[PDB]
Amino acid sequence: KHNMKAFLDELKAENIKKFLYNFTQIPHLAGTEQNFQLAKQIQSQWKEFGLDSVELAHYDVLLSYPNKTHPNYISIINEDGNEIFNTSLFEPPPPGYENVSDIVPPFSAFSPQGMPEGDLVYVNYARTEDFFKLERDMKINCSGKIVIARYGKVFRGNKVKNAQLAGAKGVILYSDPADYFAPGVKSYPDGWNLPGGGVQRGNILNLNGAGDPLTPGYPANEYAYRRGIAEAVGLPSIPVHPIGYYDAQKLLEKMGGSAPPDSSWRGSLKVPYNVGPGFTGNFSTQKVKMHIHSTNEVTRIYNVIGTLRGAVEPDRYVILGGHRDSWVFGGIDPQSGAAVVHEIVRSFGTLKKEGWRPRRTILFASWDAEEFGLLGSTEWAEENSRLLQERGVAYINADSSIEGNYTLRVDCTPLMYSLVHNLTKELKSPDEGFEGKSLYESWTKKSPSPEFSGMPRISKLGSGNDFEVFFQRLGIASGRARYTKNWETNSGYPLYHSVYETYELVEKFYDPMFKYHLTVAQVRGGMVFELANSIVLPFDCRDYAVVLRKYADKIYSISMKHPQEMKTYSVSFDSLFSAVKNFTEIASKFSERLQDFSNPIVLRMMNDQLMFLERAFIDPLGLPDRPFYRHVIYAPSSHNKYAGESFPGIYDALFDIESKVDPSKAWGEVKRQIYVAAFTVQAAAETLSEVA
Amino acid sequence: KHNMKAFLDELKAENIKKFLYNFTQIPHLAGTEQNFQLAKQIQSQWKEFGLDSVELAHYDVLLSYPNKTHPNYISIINEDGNEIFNTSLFEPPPPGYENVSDIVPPFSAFSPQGMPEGDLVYVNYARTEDFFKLERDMKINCSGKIVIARYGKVFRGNKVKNAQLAGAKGVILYSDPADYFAPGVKSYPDGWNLPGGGVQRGNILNLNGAGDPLTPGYPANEYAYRRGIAEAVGLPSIPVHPIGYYDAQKLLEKMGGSAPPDSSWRGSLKVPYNVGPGFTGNFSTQKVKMHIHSTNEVTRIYNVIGTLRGAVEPDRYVILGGHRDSWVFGGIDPQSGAAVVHEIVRSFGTLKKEGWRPRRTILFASWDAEEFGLLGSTEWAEENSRLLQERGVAYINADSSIEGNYTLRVDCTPLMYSLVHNLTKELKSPDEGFEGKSLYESWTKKSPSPEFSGMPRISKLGSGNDFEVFFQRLGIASGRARYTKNWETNSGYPLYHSVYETYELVEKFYDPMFKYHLTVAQVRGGMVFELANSIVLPFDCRDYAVVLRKYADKIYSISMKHPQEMKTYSVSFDSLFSAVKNFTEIASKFSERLQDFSNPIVLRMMNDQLMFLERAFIDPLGLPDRPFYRHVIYAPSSHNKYAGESFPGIYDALFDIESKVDPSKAWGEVKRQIYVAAFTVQAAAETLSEVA
Ligand SMILES: *[C@@H]1O[C@H](CO)[C@@H](O[C@@H]2O[C@H](CO)[C@@H](O[C@@H]3O[C@H](CO[C@H]4O[C@H](CO)[C@@H](O)[C@H](O)[C@@H]4O)[C@@H](O)[C@H](O[C@H]4O[C@H](CO)[C@@H](O)[C@H](O)[C@@H]4O)[C@@H]3O)[C@H](O)[C@H]2NC(C)=O)[C@H](O)[C@H]1NC(C)=O
Ligand SMILES: *[C@@H]1O[C@H](CO)[C@@H](O[C@@H]2O[C@H](CO)[C@@H](O[C@@H]3O[C@H](CO[C@H]4O[C@H](CO)[C@@H](O)[C@H](O)[C@@H]4O)[C@@H](O)[C@H](O[C@H]4O[C@H](CO)[C@@H](O)[C@H](O)[C@@H]4O)[C@@H]3O)[C@H](O)[C@H]2NC(C)=O)[C@H](O)[C@H]1NC(C)=O
Ligand SMILES: O=C(O)CC[C@H](NP(=O)(O)OCCC[C@H](NC(=O)CC[C@H](NC(=O)c1ccc(F)cc1)C(=O)O)C(=O)O)C(=O)O
Ligand SMILES: O=C(O)CC[C@H](NP(=O)(O)OCCC[C@H](NC(=O)CC[C@H](NC(=O)c1ccc(F)cc1)C(=O)O)C(=O)O)C(=O)O
Ligand SMILES: *[C@@H]1O[C@H](CO)[C@@H](O[C@@H]2O[C@H](CO)[C@@H](O[C@@H]3O[C@H](CO)[C@@H](O)[C@H](O)[C@@H]3O)[C@H](O)[C@H]2NC(C)=O)[C@H](O)[C@H]1NC(C)=O
Ligand SMILES: *[C@@H]1O[C@H](CO)[C@@H](O[C@@H]2O[C@H](CO)[C@@H](O[C@@H]3O[C@H](CO)[C@@H](O)[C@H](O)[C@@H]3O)[C@H](O)[C@H]2NC(C)=O)[C@H](O)[C@H]1NC(C)=O
C-alpha cells in the first residue's frame, strides 16, 4: 500500500546521516560560490529522487561581508592611542579543519562601518527591561557610550535596536559562559560547550518581515527598483561586533562605575559585572575602540524549488521549506534540517516512482540567505504571493532538526494541534526508557502542557525563521518540529553560529544513531503527508477557539492592571470576548457540518473554508508601523523577534502605557486595537458560517 | 425551460414603471426615516419575490445636513455690510410637489461651517489644468479669495480639493447653461433642461475609496472606534455651496480683473466671464459672503442584502448592487436603476418558485448613503472583505438606468467584454430604425469602438459609484450598463441632483414606454444570469492581454515626450512590455486549455484561475498615498474621480513631471512604478500558468 506508513518506513537514519556529512564538509555562506554549487547539487538530486520539476529561483539581495584585507576587531586603547589589547581576528579552527578555506571570521552582518572610541556600559542582555533599569532606576545614560551586551534571551537585532534608541555609539555582543557553557560538560571538541575563543555570528537587522532591505513588497528580480541604502529597511546605524568570553573577560574585568543592580545581571565570568560607564580608577583614561569595515553588497542568492504535482487538487500547495545557507559548516543550523528534508524528498519520490501521487501538490524548498534576514523565502513569497494567497494550504518549516536530545518541541498554528497529537500517537518514541511507547507519550511526559493534563506543550509561532512570510504576512497555516533539550536543567545550544558547529558535533554528542533526526523526519514528513493527502484538510477550527479565549483572558488581565484608566476612558473588552464566543459557536457548528456531509464541491467548499481560516486573520493594513506583520492574532514580539506575541496590536498599545505622556491618546489607541481585534475574530468566524 | 430566455422574457416594462413610480413619490435622503422605511419595504418585497434570505445590514456613518433653522446662502455685501443680494434658500418645487415635505435644500454635503467674506475669482471648471492656467500663465493668485466654478467635466470633490490647494477660502459651485441646458429644449416641467432656479446637490469629499470618513479599513459597526473629526478622511477645509444660473449670473455679472483667457472659459450666460479677482470699478468695494451652517453627524444607514443560494457553487457570489438613497426624489438617480434591480429580483424569484436555482449564489444589494461617498457599499465590503476576496466572482452595478435615450453605454473590466458582446447580440434593439435588429447592431452603429471596425465602444471603469470598493479595492471583476445620450450632439443629464429629477421627468421625456429601462434590465440581468449560471465563468483573459498592450503603449507614449530625461535616468519600459507579452502568451495557452478539458476539479481550478485573475491585479500596499486604490491597472483619476486612469501609478509619477524640482527623484519614482506595474502584470499572468 501507498499510505503514510509506506512513506514513513522508507525514511532511514543512515541516509539522513550521509546527507548531513555531505552538506557540512565546507562552508555554505549565502551568496558564495560554494552555496550556489550546493544549490545545483540539491536541484540535481531532487530531480533524480523523482520530483516533477526542480528549479532554481534567484534574486539579487543586500548581503554583508567582512573585508578580507581590513579585518574587524576591538581594542582597549590607552591615552597615547596605543591599542594595548585586541580581540581575536578568527576562531581557532577545530581538529582537522585548520586548513579549511573560506571560513567567514566572526562579524555582525549588516553592521555599518566605523571606528568609534569611547567608554563602555554593560547592559546585561540589552533587553527592553534592561534599558528601563539603566535609564529609569539606575540613572545611567548610554548616550555616546559603547554598550557591551551578552547574547541570550532575545534576538540580537532587538538588542541593537534597543542600544541604538538608548543613544549608544556602538555595540559589543559576547557569549557569557552563564548562557553558553552547561556546567559539567567539556567544551568543543571534547564536549558540546562553547570554548572561550568561540564566537556567535549573526545578522542584526530589524526587518519586521520586509525581506531584502532594498525591495520591500516586491521580489528582487532582474528589473527591480532598489531603494538607496539610506532608505533601506532595517539596517543598524551604529557599529556592532561579536566576541567570545576570553575576549569579553578582558573588556569587562576593568569596568568601574555602578555595581550590577542584582544577581540577574551577573554572568559566570570572574568579573564584577559593573555597569560602568568606563573603567575603574587606574584605567579610567583607557577607552574601547571598535574597527568595523564590513560592506553591504547586493549579491545573487538561489532557492531550490521542487514540485510534486497533486493527482486531484494540483492547485493546492503544501510546502515543506527550510534553509540551506549557513554561517560556517551548519552542522546543526541548518544542515540537520536540510538533510531531513532531503530524505523526506527521497521517500516521497520512491512512492512517486511506484505510481503514487499525493492528492495535493507538495512544494519542497531549499531557501537561501535565511541567515541574512529570511531573504530567500521572503523574496520568493513576494514573487508568488498571489499563488500562495489563493492556493497555500500549509507551510511546514525545516531548519535545525536537533538542539538537544531530550524531547520534541513543536510550534504551530492552533489549526495543526490535533494533526500533531494524532500523528505523534502513531510514531514510536526514540527516547531511552520509552521503548515500545509512542512519541506522544514520551513528549507529553517530558514536556507537559501548562494547561491540560495528559497533553504536551505546543508553543505559539514566533519568528527568526523562514515561516515568517508564509504565516505572519500571508496567513498560511504553519508549523515546525524539532528535538530539543530539557529547558529546566539548562538559550538554544552553545555552539550556535560558531566554526565548532560541525558534523562531528552532531555525530559525537547530539545524535550518534541519528534516531532523533529520524523522529523529526517522521514528524515533519508525516505532517506534510497528512496535509497533502487527507481528503478533509486536517485542521480543527475548534482549537483556534480555545486559544483565542486564552489570549483574550491574557490581554484583558494586562489591561486590568489599570482599572482607573479603564474606567476613565471606558475601555471595554466586551466586543473581543463577544467575538471569541461567536467564533467558538460557529466553529462548533462548522465541525458538526464537516463530520455530517460523496459531494466533492461541499468537500472542497469546506476545505476552502478550512484553508482560508488562517487567511482570515490577516489585516491588509498590517500592524502599526509594521506593514508586513498582518496576522492580528500573532506577531513576533516587538521586543524579541524570536518570541510570538498574541493580540500583538493590543499588547503593544498597552505596553509601558503608564509612561505615556498623553494617557487619553494612549488608551484611545488601546480601544482602537480592541476594535480591530474583535472585528477580525468575528470576520474569521463568519468565514466558517454557511456560505449562503 | 429554465434558461436565460425564460429569465429575460419574465422582465416587464410595466413592472419597472410601477416600481419607479413607487420609489419616487417622496424623498429618500440617506439617514432619514423615509429611506429606512423604503429599505424595510424592499426587504419585505424581496422576501415575497422568493429570495432565500433578505437582511438589513446597518452602519453608523458620518453624514452631513443643512441646519433647518439656520439656512445656507450666499450674499453680495456692500461696504457697510448690507447684504444687497442673497442667493435662493430652495428650488421652486415642480408642479404638484409644492406641498411635499422634507426636500433637502441645495447644499454641498460635508462642507465645514463658516462665513467667509472676500473677492471672487472665476476658475472655469476648477480642473487641475484650469488652476495651472490661472497660476502659471495668468499669474492670478487664488489665495484668500472665494472661488466660483462651474459644475461639469470632473467630479465636484476634485474641484474643491483643487481650490483648497490654490489657497481659496471658499468655493461656489454653479450650473452653467452651457453645460446644463441643451439648445432647443425647454426647461422643466416643459422639457428636460435645468431651469435658472435649479441647483445640483452633491457631496464634495475626497475619500479615495475610504468609505465612512471616521472608520477607514473597518466596518462602522456598533463597537467601532472612530477617528476624531480632525483626523477624518477626505473632508474639505473650506466652505462650499452650490447655486443655479439665475443666482450665478448675479455673482458673475459684476466681475472685473482679467478677461477670460480664451473661449473654453466662457459659458452661455450674458456675462464677460472675467476671472477677477473682484468686481469692476464701481462695485470694487462690494464683496461676496458665504453663510454655511451645515453639520456633520454620525447617522444610521441601512443596506438591504438579498441572497439566492447557488445549487452547485453556493460559495461563489455574483453580486447585483445599486443604491437606494437619493438627494431628493431620485427619478433617475438611483431609482431608475433600483426599479430595474427590483424587477430583476422578481424575475429570478419567479424561476426560483418553479424549482430553479442558479449554479452560483446571487447576492442582491440596495445600498444606502451612496450619495454621501459610497458609504453603504464600502462599509459592507469592509465588513465582508474576506468572504468577498475568496468567493466574489463579479459585481454588476445598478445605478441610473437611463441618462438619455440614444444608445447603450457599458463600462467594465476587459474580462467581461466578450460576455457583453455575446449577450447584446442576443437582445433586441429598442431603438427607432433598428426594429428586428440586435442591441449589439444598434449600439455598434451608434457608438463605434475607436479601435475596431464592427465593435462597440466599452469604457474603462472610473469611479463615483458603488462598484469602487469591489473593483479598485478588492479586485472583483465589475461592470455596468445604462442607456445614454449622443455625446456628439450635446455632461450627464441636466436635472441631475435637482428637485426636478422626478418620475414625470422620466415618464414624459426620457422613456415613456419604459423600453430603454427594459433593455437595461435585460443587459444587467442577463450579465448576472450568465455570471451565475455558466458552467465555465464567462471571462476571456485574452481581452485583458489586448488592453494591457494598449495601456502600455499609451503610458510609454506619455514618457516619450521626455526623451532627454529617459536617456539621463535610463528609464526603460522594456520590463512592462515583456510582462504584457508574457501575459498575452500565457493567456492564449490558458484559453486553449479552457477549451480542451467531465472533470469538475479541473473546471473549478480553471474557474478559480478565472475568478482570481482580476484579483491578481491588486497590490496589497495600494497606490501612493491612496491605500484603498489597490488595483495596479485601473484607478480613479487623481484629477477626476469619475474617470478611470490606466497604469495610474506610472501615470501620476509622470504627471506634470517637468515642473518637479528634483528630476532625479521624480524619474526614480517613474522607474519604481514601471517595476511595480511590470511585476504585477507578470504575477497576474503566472496565475494563468499550469498550477503545478
Ligand atoms: C456575536 O454574534 C451576535 C449574534 O448572535 C452579534 O449580535 C449582534 O449584536 C449587534 C451589536 O450589539 C446587534 O446590533 C443591534 O442591532 C439592532 C437591530 O437588530 C435588528 O435588525 C438587524 C438587521 O435588521 C438584525 O440582524 C437583528 O436580528 C435585529 O432584527 C439595533 O437596533 C441596535 O442598535 C440600538 O441599540 C444600540 C445599543 O444600545 C444603540 O447603540 C443604538 O443607538 C440603537 O438604539 C444594535 O445595533 C445585532 O442585532 C446583533 N445581531 C443579532 C443578535 O443577531 C454580535 O455582534 C457578535 N459579536 C461581534 C463582536 O460581532
Ligand atoms: C517574461 O517571460 C520570460 C520567460 O519566457 C522571462 O524571462 C526571464 O528573464 C529573466 C530576466 O531577464 C532571465 O533572467 C536571467 O536568468 C539567467 C539564469 O537563467 C537560468 O537559470 C534559471 C533558473 O536556474 C532558469 O529559469 C533559466 O531557464 C536559465 O536556465 C541569469 O544568469 C541572468 O543574469 C545574468 O545576466 C544578467 C543580464 O545581463 C545580468 O544582469 C546578471 O548579472 C547575470 O550576469 C538573468 O537573471 C530568466 O532566465 C528568464 N527566464 C527564462 C528565459 O526562462 C521574463 O522575465 C518575463 N518578463 C517579466 C517582466 O517577468
Ligand atoms: O533574521 C532572522 O529573522 C533570523 C536569522 C537567523 N535564524 P536561525 O539562526 O536559522 O534560527 C534561529 C531561530 C531561534 C529561535 N528561537 C526561539 O524560538 C526561542 C524563543 C523562546 N522559546 C524557547 O527558547 C523555547 C525552548 C524550548 C521549547 F520546548 C519551547 C520554546 C521564547 O519564546 O522566548 C528557534 O529556536 O526557533 C538568526 O536567528 O540569526
Ligand atoms: O461620492 C462619490 O464617489 C459619488 C457620489 C455620487 N454618485 P452618483 O451621483 O450616484 O453617480 C455619479 C456617476 C457619474 C459618473 N460619470 C461618469 O462616469 C462620466 C465620466 C466621463 N465619461 C462620460 O461622460 C461618458 C459618457 C458617455 C459614454 F458612452 C461613455 C463615457 C469621463 O470618463 O470623463 C457616471 O455617469 O457613472 C456623485 O457623483 O455625487
Ligand atoms: C484526530 O484523531 C481523532 C480521533 O480519531 C479524530 O476525531 C475523530 O474524527 C472522526 C472522523 O470524523 C469522528 O468519527 C465520526 O463520529 C461521529 C459520531 O460520533 C459520526 O457522525 C461520523 O460519521 C464519524 O464516525 C470521531 O468522532 C472523532 N473522534 C473524536 C473527536 O474524539 C480527529 O478528527 C483527528 N484530528 C485530525 C485528523 O485533525
Ligand atoms: C462568445 O461567443 C463566442 C462565439 O460563440 C464564444 O467563442 C466560442 O466558444 C466556443 C465554446 O468553447 C468554441 O467552440 C470550440 O471550438 C473548438 C474548435 O474550434 C473546439 O476545440 C471546442 O470543442 C469547441 O467546439 C468556439 O471556437 C468559440 N468561437 C470563437 C472564439 O470564435 C465565446 O466563448 C463567447 N464568450 C464568452 C462566453 O465569454
Ligand SMILES: *[C@@H]1O[C@H](CO[C@@H]2O[C@@H](C)[C@@H](O)[C@@H](O)[C@@H]2O)[C@@H](O[C@@H]2O[C@H](CO)[C@@H](O)[C@H](O)[C@H]2NC(C)=O)[C@H](O)[C@H]1NC(C)=O
Ligand atoms: C577592503 O580593504 C582594502 C584594504 O584596506 C587597506 O588595508 C587596511 C589594513 C587599511 O590600512 C586600509 O586603510 C587600507 O586601504 C581596501 O583596498 C584599498 O582601497 C583603497 C581605495 O579606497 C586603495 O587606495 C588602497 O590601495 C587599497 N588597499 C589595498 C591593500 O588593496 C578596499 O577598498 C576594501 N574593500 C571594500 C571596501 O570592499
Ligand SMILES: *[C@@H]1O[C@H](CO[C@@H]2O[C@@H](C)[C@@H](O)[C@@H](O)[C@@H]2O)[C@@H](O[C@@H]2O[C@H](CO)[C@@H](O)[C@H](O)[C@H]2NC(C)=O)[C@H](O)[C@H]1NC(C)=O
Ligand atoms: C593591536 O592591533 C594594532 C593594529 O595592528 C594591525 O591590524 C591588525 C588587525 C593586524 O592585522 C596587525 O597585524 C596590523 O598591524 C597594533 O597596532 C599597530 O602596530 C603596528 C606595528 O607595531 C604599527 O606600525 C601600527 O601603526 C599600529 N596600528 C594601530 C592602529 O595602532 C597593536 O600593536 C595591536 N596590539 C596588541 C597588544 O597586539
Ligand SMILES: *[C@@H]1O[C@H](CO[C@@H]2O[C@@H](C)[C@@H](O)[C@@H](O)[C@@H]2O)[C@@H](O[C@@H]2O[C@H](CO)[C@@H](O)[C@H](O)[C@H]2NC(C)=O)[C@H](O)[C@H]1NC(C)=O
Ligand atoms: C441650528 O441652528 C439653530 C438656530 O440658529 C439660530 O437662528 C439662526 C437664524 C442664527 O441667528 C443663529 O445664530 C441662532 O442661534 C441652533 O439653535 C440655537 O443654538 C444656540 C446654542 O448654540 C441657542 O442658544 C439658541 O437659542 C438656538 N436657537 C434656536 C432658534 O433654537 C442650533 O444650534 C443649530 N443646530 C445644529 C448646529 O445642529
Ligand SMILES: *[C@@H]1O[C@H](CO[C@@H]2O[C@@H](C)[C@@H](O)[C@@H](O)[C@@H]2O)[C@@H](O[C@@H]2O[C@H](CO)[C@@H](O)[C@H](O)[C@H]2NC(C)=O)[C@H](O)[C@H]1NC(C)=O
Ligand atoms: C439677505 O438676507 C439677510 C439676512 O436675512 C435673514 O436670513 C435669511 C436667510 C432669511 O431667513 C431672512 O428672513 C433673515 O432675516 C438680510 O439682512 C437682514 O435683514 C433683517 C431685516 O431687515 C435685519 O434685521 C438683519 O440684521 C439682517 N441680517 C444680516 C445678516 O444682515 C438682507 O436684507 C437680505 N437682502 C436682500 C436683498 O434681501
Ligand SMILES: *[C@@H]1O[C@H](CO)[C@@H](O[C@@H]2O[C@H](CO)[C@@H](O)[C@H](O)[C@H]2NC(C)=O)[C@H](O)[C@H]1NC(C)=O
Ligand atoms: C555530496 O554528494 C554529492 C552527490 O553524490 C557529490 O557530488 C557528486 O560527486 C561525484 C564525484 O565528484 C560526481 O561524479 C557527481 O557528478 C556529483 N553529483 C552531483 C553534484 O549531483 C558530492 O561530491 C558530495 N560532496 C561531498 C563534500 O562529499
Ligand SMILES: *[C@@H]1O[C@H](CO)[C@@H](O[C@@H]2O[C@H](CO)[C@@H](O)[C@H](O)[C@H]2NC(C)=O)[C@H](O)[C@H]1NC(C)=O
Ligand atoms: C409602494 O409599494 C408598496 C408595496 O405595495 C406599498 O406599501 C404597501 O402599502 C399597503 C397599503 O398601505 C400596505 O397594506 C402594505 O403593507 C405595504 N407593503 C409593504 C410596505 O411591503 C407602498 O404604499 C407604495 N408606496 C407608494 C408611495 O405608492
Ligand SMILES: *[C@@H]1O[C@H](CO)[C@@H](O)[C@H](O)[C@H]1NC(C)=O
Ligand atoms: C545623555 O547624554 C547627553 C549629554 O552628553 C545628553 O545630550 C542627553 O540628552 C542625555 N540624556 C539624559 C536622559 O540624561
Ligand SMILES: *[C@@H]1O[C@H](CO)[C@@H](O)[C@H](O)[C@H]1NC(C)=O
Ligand atoms: C544527550 O542525552 C544524554 C542523556 O540524558 C545527556 O546526558 C547529554 O547531555 C545529551 N547531549 C546533548 C548534546 O544534549
Ligand SMILES: *[C@@H]1O[C@H](CO)[C@@H](O)[C@H](O)[C@H]1NC(C)=O
Ligand atoms: C498669494 O497670496 C498671499 C499674500 O496674500 C501670499 O502669502 C502667497 O504666498 C501668494 N502666492 C503667490 C504664488 O504669489
Ligand SMILES: *[C@@H]1O[C@H](CO)[C@@H](O)[C@H](O)[C@H]1NC(C)=O
Ligand atoms: C429622446 O429621443 C428623441 C429622438 O431622438 C430626442 O429628440 C430627445 O431629445 C430624447 N430625449 C431625451 C431626454 O434625451
Ligand SMILES: [Ca+2]
Ligand atoms: Ca523584496
Ligand SMILES: [Ca+2]
Ligand atoms: Ca469603515
Ligand SMILES: [Cl-]
Ligand atoms: Cl524548524
Ligand SMILES: [Cl-]
Ligand atoms: Cl450603473
Ligand SMILES: [Zn+2]
Ligand atoms: Zn537556521
Ligand SMILES: [Zn+2]
Ligand atoms: Zn542560524
